[PDB]
Amino acid sequence: VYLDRKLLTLEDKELGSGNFGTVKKGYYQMKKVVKTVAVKILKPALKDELLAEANVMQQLDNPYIVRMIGICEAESWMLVMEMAELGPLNKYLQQNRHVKDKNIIELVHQVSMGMKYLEESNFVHRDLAARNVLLVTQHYAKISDFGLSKALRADENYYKAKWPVKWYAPECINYYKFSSKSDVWSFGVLMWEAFSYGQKPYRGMKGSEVTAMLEKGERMGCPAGCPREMYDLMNLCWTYDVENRPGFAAVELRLRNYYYDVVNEGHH
Numbered sequence: 001v002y003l004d005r006k007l008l009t010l011e012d013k014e015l016g017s018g019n020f021g022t023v024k025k026g027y028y029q030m031k032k033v034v035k036t037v038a039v040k041i042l043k044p045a046l047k048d049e050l051l052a053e054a055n056v057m058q059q060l061d062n063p064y065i066v067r068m069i070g071i072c073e074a075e076s077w078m079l080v081m082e083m084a085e086l087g088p089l090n091k092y093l094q095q096n097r098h099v100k101d102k103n104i105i106e107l108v109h110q111v112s113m114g115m116k117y118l119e120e121s122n123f124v125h126r127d128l129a130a131r132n133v134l135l136v137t138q139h140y141a142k143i144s145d146f147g148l149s150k151a152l153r154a155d156e157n158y159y160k161a162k163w164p165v166k167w168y169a170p171e172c173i174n175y176y177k178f179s180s181k182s183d184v185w186s187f188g189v190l191m192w193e194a195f196s197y198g199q200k201p202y203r204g205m206k207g208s209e210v211t212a213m214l215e216k217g218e219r220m221g222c223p224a225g226c227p228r229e230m231y232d233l234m235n236l237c238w239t240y241d242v243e244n245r246p247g248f249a250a251v252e253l254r255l256r257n258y259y260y261d262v263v264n265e266g267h268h
């Protein structure tokens, strides 16, 4: 998990900013090859957040989840991860409005596979949104930003807690309870975003207005050109009662089946 600072090269080209510090592009010398990396570089709390994030990613091993290369203490604390070259899913779709329907289904299904793995691993993401799905290629998506993520206790299926309200299930808002099912709810908002080509959900509404809207049984409308089968899945993800809402196993299967229908139809 601990990396050799001299084996790491940093570019001055920035990928993002925040109170934590900056994320920059770089290269790390592996056993024989050079690997392109994204490096989170810190500006006590911030450090322990970083180490907790690192410790979560250290446990995870999946094609559809950004990999950690390791960590590094030097000028600042550094978290070195594999680079997703195409950037965040929302910005991508905003900038490429001609991405096809089969292709969006393919990506969101890839996210359901990453999330199925995380459910199986008993981790809650807690920040699953299109901004946190990074593209390796136009046909290869990975889940990132595990800064809010939690390993679940062996005896509990939920974690008890500024919040991204628009992606949050009622039980999170009302009882501060975050489970894989509440991640499923975010996945539904994430789906809406992807079929809206990266538009913010609940446009023009404040967090409390959204809460009031959902409480009243109201949901976001079908995005233009979204297949009814995919909008149905969004709504199913938006099931108020945690206990009736599907888990990622069922969600991923629904998406898998439908993608193969669209893959089949294309050939016909």
Ligand SMILES: COc1cc(Nc2ncc(F)c(Nc3ccc4c(n3)NC(=O)C(C)(C)O4)n2)cc(OC)c1OC
Pocket (backbone or CB within 6 Å): 014, 015, 016, 017, 018, 023, 038, 066, 081, 082, 083, 084, 085, 086, 087, 088, 134, 144
């Ligand atoms: C090539 O263009 C881009 C590429 C990437 N690739 C990429 N791969 C793996 C990663 F771990 C990674 N991490 C990362 C990067 C930046 C960040 C954050 N994380 N976190 C943040 O809170 C904000 C969002 C503040 O800045 N980025 C991300 C882009 O934005 C996330 C982007 O657009 C600039």
